[PDB]
């Protein structure tokens, strides 16, 4: 699913 | 600009990137890749104040089909959801599943079929919506199946055994055994075994594509890149994913 972009 | 209006304002400047890929595979019974390619698009859903100059950075696994190309795309996005790019790959593809069929004939009456699927990806990731489709001959009078994981029905109308599995983590193995009861048939008619086909969904890009950054520069307005809340997700789905038995 949506994960924070690093 | 004909794709973006002038005075857009968001307290919460946020964006979402979708890497959406279809992986296609035709494999021989022994495990030779006869054909493999990925089709992908990147969809952006953006809620950014003003007229932001964006720069999308990836990792060059890709053959790309209004922006400005430089591994790196620069663009001012339209507000809301839009398609940033389409692409295709044939090289260095992650095949998420190996299908290993086994078919033994037993007189003119039984077909003994065992199918093993192996997940080839990180064990911390889950495939979902897995379906394994095993064709059965038209003179089929019945099917017995055993499978320790998931559920399987013989669907006579579709002439297939359909094995469904909700979840499967990477680096795992599962099998189904089927006994296909056969009716008498015209002798010269010999069965040409159609491929075993899969469907699945994986939370990574089979191409290998990685989003590295999406940088937002908006020179007039008083927010900057570290203010922008940024999300990415990968949805790899099967296209034609067939293994010859
Ligand atoms: Ni959204
Ligand atoms: Ni600041």
Residue numbers in the entry:
A (entry chain P): 1 to 6
B (entry chain A): 159 to 223, 227 to 231, 261 to 435
Pull text from the paper.
We also analyzed the crystal structures of μ2 C-terminal subdomain (C-μ2) bound to IRS-1 YxxΦ motifs. Importantly, the side chains of Tyr and Met residues of IRS-1 YxxΦ motifs are inserted into the binding pockets of μ2, which are shared by the AP2 cargo proteins. Collectively, these results indicate that IRS-1 is recognized by the AP2 complex via the μ2 subunit in the very similar manner to conventional endocytic cargos. Using IRS-1 truncated mutants, we mapped the central region (amino acid residues 543–865) which is necessary for the binding to AP2. This region is almost identical to that for the clathrin adaptor AP1 complex found in our previous study, which binds to YxxΦ motifs of IRS-1 including Tyr 608, Tyr 628, and Tyr 658 via its μ1 subunit. Indeed, the Ala mutation of all these Tyr residues in IRS-1, but not a single substitution, completely abolished the binding to μ2 in vitro (IRS-1 3YA mutant). The Tyr residues of the YxxΦ motifs of IRS-1 (Tyr608, 628, and 658) critical for the binding to AP2 are part of phosphorylation sites among multiple Tyr residues in the C-terminus of IRS-1 that mediate the interaction of IRS-1 with PI3K and subsequent activation of PI3K. In addition, AP2 would preferentially bind non-phosphorylated IRS-1 since AP2 cannot recognize phosphorylated YxxΦ sequence due to its limited capacity. Our results indicate that IRS-1 inhibits the recruitment of IGF-IR to CCPs through YxxΦ motifs in IRS-1.
